[PDB]
């Protein structure tokens, strides 16, 4: 039960819905950034040393350790979508010859606005302290941000670029999606546009369309922000105690 699908789509291109559509088909786990956050936070440093290696170019000896860490991380998983893995799709291809590649795309301008509200907001965007704060509540360190911005640099194949540049991102986003359709043979690749549904995915994977189930539409703007402000408003039990001792505790002043 090794890798069968490689999700090269970038964040906010429908990577969680694709994840869920693959687990419905194969009934096996699919890797995702939310796996790291909610279950395997110990994989952050692994992905980091893997990204440190790719900062410089790799000796043949170097790449075998890359392939040996990717097998460790992705063992037991049938597929992989989202960052930081979508950037390693070339290494995953040579490594799993019987694995196909799916590329989720959407309108480049719709992606940017979404990409700015959820993933990486402009460092002046007031919504910065919000995304960063729920990270702290979930136990995400400075090294998480490190591993996240670095994986972006790797996926776009650019040592650094001013990420506060909307047009720069578009040029990187358009490039990446273009270079994926060039490096990967058409017979091994599928380009899944938002809303394509089961038919293409299932024909390209040679499986039955799941019966009675509807193609996922998860991780929408509405639900990501609602869950965000829900965690910001969350109250630790230790916090509830302090607020109770001011109502009911003996009052000193």
- Taking the complex as a whole, the smallest distance from the CB of residue 75 to ligand A3P amounts, in Å, to 23
- Taking the complex as a whole, the smallest distance from the CB of residue 65 to ligand A3P amounts, in Å, to 29
Residues 139 and 59: their CA atoms lie apart, in Å, by 35
Q: After which residues is the chain broken (C to N over 2.5 A)?
A: none
Residues 223 and 243: their CA atoms lie apart, in Å, by 29
Query: How many CB atoms are closer than 10 A to CB 148?
Result: 21
CB 121 within 8 A of CB 128: yes
Pick the binder of ligand A3P from 36, 47, 87, 114 (CB under 6 A): 114
Which among 77, 12, 10, 17 has a CA at the least distance from the CA of 43? Answer: 77
Q: What SS3 state is found at 218?
A: coil
CB 213 within 8 A of CB 227: no
Among the listed ranges 7-15, 54-62, 83-91, 131-139, the one in contact with ligand A3P (CB under 6 A) is 7-15
Pick the binder of ligand A3P from 4, 13, 48, 155 (CB under 6 A): 13
Residues 42 and 40: their CA atoms lie apart, in Å, by 5
Does the protein bind ligand A3P through residue 11 (CB under 6 A)? yes
**Which of residues 48 and 81 has its CB atom nearest to ligand A3P in the complex?**
81
- Taking the complex as a whole, the smallest distance from the CB of residue 33 to ligand A3P amounts, in Å, to 9
Among the listed ranges 50-58, 124-132, 217-225, 241-249, the one in contact with ligand A3P (CB under 6 A) is 217-225
Among the listed ranges 62-70, 164-172, 178-186, 218-226, the one in contact with ligand A3P (CB under 6 A) is 218-226
10 Å CB burial of residue 126 (0-12, 13-18, 19+) is: exposed
User: How many residues sit close enough to ligand A3P to count as binding (CB under 6 A)?
Assistant: 17
Does the protein bind ligand A3P through residue 221 (CB under 6 A)? yes
Does the protein bind ligand A3P through residue 217 (CB under 6 A)? yes
CB 224 within 8 A of CB 127: no
Question: φ, ψ for residue 101 (rounded to 5)?
Answer: -120, 135
Site string for ligand A3P, 187-216 (x = CB under 6 A): -------xx-------------------xx
Site string for ligand A3P, 57-96 (x = CB under 6 A): -------------------------x--------------
Pick the binder of ligand A3P from 65, 149, 207, 220 (CB under 6 A): 220
Residues 21 and 216: their CA atoms lie apart, in Å, by 6
Contacts to ligand A3P by CB under 6 A: 11-17, 82, 114, 194-195, 215-217, 219-221
């Amino acid at each position: 039960t090794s890798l069968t699908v490689i999700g090269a789509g970038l964040p906010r291109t429908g990577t969680l819905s694709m994840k869920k559509a693959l687990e419905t088909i194969y009934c096996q786990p699919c890797y995702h950034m939310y796996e790291i956050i909610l279950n395997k936070q110990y994989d952050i440093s692994k992905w980091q040393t893997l990204l440190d290696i790719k900062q410089s170019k790799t000796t043949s000896n170097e790449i075998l350790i890359i392939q040996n860490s990717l097998k460790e991380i992705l063992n037991g998983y049938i597929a992989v979508t989202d960052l930081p893995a979508c950037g390693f799709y070339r290494e995953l291809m040579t490594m799993y010859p019987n694995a196909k590649v799916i590329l989720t795309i959407r309108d480049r301008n719709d992606w940017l606005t979404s990409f700015r509200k959820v993933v990486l907001p402009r460092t002046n965007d007031t919504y910065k302290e919000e995304v960063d704060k729920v990270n702290r509540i979930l136990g995400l360190n400075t090294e998480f941000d490190k591993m996240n911005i670095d994986s972006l640099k790797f996926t776009f194949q650019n040592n650094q670029i001013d990420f506060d540049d909307d047009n720069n991102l578009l040029e990187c986003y358009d490039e990446y999606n273009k270079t994926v359709q060039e490096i990967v043979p058409s017979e091994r690749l599928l380009v899944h546009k938002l809303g394509d549904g089961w038919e293409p995915l299932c024909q390209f994977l040679n499986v039955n369309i799941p019966i009675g189930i509807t193609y996922p539409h998860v991780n929408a703007l509405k639900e990501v922000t609602e869950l965000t402000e829900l965690l910001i408003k969350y109250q630790s039990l230790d916090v509830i105690k302090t607020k109770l001792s001011e109502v009911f505790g003996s009052h000193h002043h």
